[PDB]
Design a binder for this molecule. Structure first.
Ligand code: K
Ligand code: K
Ligand code: K
Ligand code: MG
Ligand code: MG
Ligand code: MG
Ligand code: MG
Ligand code: MG
Ligand code: MG
Ligand code: MG
Ligand code: MG
Ligand code: MG
Ligand code: MG
Ligand code: MG
Ligand code: MG
Ligand code: MG
Ligand code: MG
Ligand code: MG
Ligand code: MG
Ligand code: MG
Ligand code: MG
Ligand code: MG
Lengths: 77, 127, 26, 75, 90
RNA sequence: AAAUCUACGGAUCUACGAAGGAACGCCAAAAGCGAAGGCAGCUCUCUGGGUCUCUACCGACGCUGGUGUGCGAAAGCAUGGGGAGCGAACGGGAUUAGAUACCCUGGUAGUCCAUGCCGUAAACGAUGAGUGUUCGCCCUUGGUCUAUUCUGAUCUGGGGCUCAGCUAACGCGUUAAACACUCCGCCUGGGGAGUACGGUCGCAAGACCAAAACUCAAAGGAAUUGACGGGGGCCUGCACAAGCGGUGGAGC
């Protein structure tokens, strides 16, 4: 594993391996399964799936990862 | 204006199959559903969360179709609470199409019991 | 006494028990 | 553990049920349920590994809290 | 928190004082640990033994999963008034 | 991944009731007790040991200990019961080149109780029992004294860290692998070998004591530098993913 020493805080020891709009996609496919694969009469699910991609365009690759510098510097000082 | 005998939804979430059963207040079964008895799932795997919340969806639609308005949800299983919470909200999804219609659920309960060192469990699997 | 030294004793004991069960059945 | 839902707010009832299953300790025991049989000679090994992990976490939290409380209270 | 002392526990702890012993069970019906009351090990041993004796005698629940929560003085029956609800909201 | 198995004679699921066997969740553990093996639901009976206090008694009555005697996980053996769950042997279904195995499904002996036998374990702290001395710090089990409301002191066992000291190194460190001593057991290069022969014990399985011929010049312990891992973490490559055109087919 990683070399044990000082203080280290993992950038992935939280919920971040979660690529969004999985649940929206499976509800959209549930509509197709119920309504024998027809895009009609559940256009609200299609609107939800498209506003997923608009919000995915809004969000970018984000995390907070400068924590370890602060921990190391303040532990030394 | 308080009534007494609400229907009961039991949701046992085992490891390889989830059972949802709709009973009255004295225990008489009115309808039931399992993972393997769904019309679309065709073999292969059954322990994933999709089989559980699909069974909850199916029972929710079937309970809406028989005109019930007052249910009490009892959940049983040796799993994390996230899966029980997801199964309950999937049942609400089955009853109400857009999460807009009023909640028929009037009570939620967890009925999961542990053996007090009873029988001896089977051996490990050297896979 | 390491495992590499215990394995020689293991094999010798296994062979002796096998021969005892064979020859001692008379 | 039974929780009554008021005014049709299912999310508040589910959060209350989750927190009560947490604080009653039943969630720890419902996760500690075993699928197979473990002998006492393996229960000892698992308890020892648990103890070592706990000691490491105690040292980490002690040092983190000390360096927090040095800075935060006017120093 | 609720203040309990080892001397208080050592004077009150008995399987007939179910009202006092009900401080030391959770909503799941299981026994509270020592570290969240601060009493000594002798006090914890006495509390656990008396709660076990009361459970065998029938005055306290073994477990409360599938049943209502245990408070002193009222019945543990599963009557029709356990699940009273409202209909005027619909 | 499946199949055997089981189910329309109505299974799984749901409520109530009945039977029977084994183990005692939470408390709960670097806790406690025991010479060691070991000992976990609760109430009573009988009993072994231990700790603290005393301006109490007695007066070296002590330590170790060959030959001997007693206790001694588990499996196993004999007689009589019991049998839920698990499960050697064995039947079947899969996997594979084969699979007398790993995986799945049934399941006898056994695991349990009463009375006896055997007397072995990585029975391990891989550290025999005992006595005296050696700088401290932080926790904790059970007491006693003093308190000045929150603490100090002194015994008793259990743990963590360490000055010295010791150690081939790893490490030990007031519960020593430190500074010394008393008594017991054991070792004298590897293989052959805990094997052969003999005696004692056992209903058996086997246990205890325990060689030689021959053969080799090594067999080893700890750590270092590389390499490797169907062990892990962080990266990265027309290697893959997304496309486009070929080669293997024809003639030259
Ligand atoms: K003693
Ligand atoms: K003696
Ligand atoms: K040390
Ligand atoms: Mg040796
Ligand atoms: Mg002891
Ligand atoms: Mg036995
Ligand atoms: Mg018999
Ligand atoms: Mg098997
Ligand atoms: Mg076979
Ligand atoms: Mg079986
Ligand atoms: Mg031996
Ligand atoms: Mg042992
Ligand atoms: Mg001795
Ligand atoms: Mg003390
Ligand atoms: Mg001490
Ligand atoms: Mg030194
Ligand atoms: Mg000493
Ligand atoms: Mg030495
Ligand atoms: Mg031998
Ligand atoms: Mg002989
Ligand atoms: Mg490609
Ligand atoms: Mg060609």
């Amino acid at each position: 594993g990683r070399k044990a020493g000082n203080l280290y805080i993992n950038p992935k020891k939280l919920g971040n391996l979660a690529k969004p709009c999985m649940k929206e996609m499976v509800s959209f496919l549930n509509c197709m399964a119920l309504n024998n694969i027809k895009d009609d009469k559940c256009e609200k699910q299609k609107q939800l799936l498209s506003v997923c991609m608009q919000g995915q365009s809004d969000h970018k690759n984000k995390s907070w990862g400068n924590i370890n510098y602060h921990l190391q510097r303040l532990t030394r000082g | 204006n308080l009534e007494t005998n609400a229907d009961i939804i039991h949701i046992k979430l085992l490891r390889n199959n989830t059972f949802v059963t709709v009973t009255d207040s004295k225990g008489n079964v009115k309808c039931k559903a399992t993972s393997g008895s769904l019309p679309d799932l065709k073999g292969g795997r059954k322990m994933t969360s999709y089989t559980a919340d699909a069974t909850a969806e199916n029972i929710g639609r079937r309970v809406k179709a028989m005109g019930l308005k007052s249910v009490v949800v009892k959940v049983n299983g040796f799993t994390h609470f996230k899966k029980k919470r997801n199964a309950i909200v999937a049942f609400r999804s089955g009853y109400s199409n857009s999460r807009n219609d009023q909640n028929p659920i009037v009570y939620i309960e967890d009925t999961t019991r542990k053996a007090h060192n009873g029988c001896r469990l089977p051996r490990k699997r050297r896979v | 006494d390491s495992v590499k030294k215990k394995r020689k004793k293991k094999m010798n004991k296994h062979k002796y028990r096998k021969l005892r069960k064979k020859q001692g059945r008379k | 553990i039974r929780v009554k839902v008021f005014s049709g707010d299912l999310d508040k009832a589910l959060t209350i049920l989750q927190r009560k299953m947490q604080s009653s300790g039943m969630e720890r025991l419902i996760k500690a349920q075993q699928t197979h049989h473990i002998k006492n000679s393996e229960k000892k090994v698992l308890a020892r590994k648990n103890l070592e992990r706990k000691i490491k976490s105690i040292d980490f939290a002690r040092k983190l809290q000390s360096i927090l409380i040095k800075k935060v209270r006017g120093l | 928190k609720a203040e309990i002392t080892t001397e208080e526990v050592l004077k009150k702890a008995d399987f007939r004082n179910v009202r006092f012993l009900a401080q030391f069970i959770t909503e799941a019906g299981i026994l509270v640990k020592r570290k969240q009351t601060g009493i000594s090990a002798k006090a914890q041993r006495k509390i656990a033994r008396e709660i076990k004796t009361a459970r065998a005698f029938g005055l306290m629940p073994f477990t409360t999963m599938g049943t209502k929560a245990f408070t002193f003085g009222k019945t543990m029956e599963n009557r029709d008034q356990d699940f009273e609800y409202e209909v005027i909201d619909d």
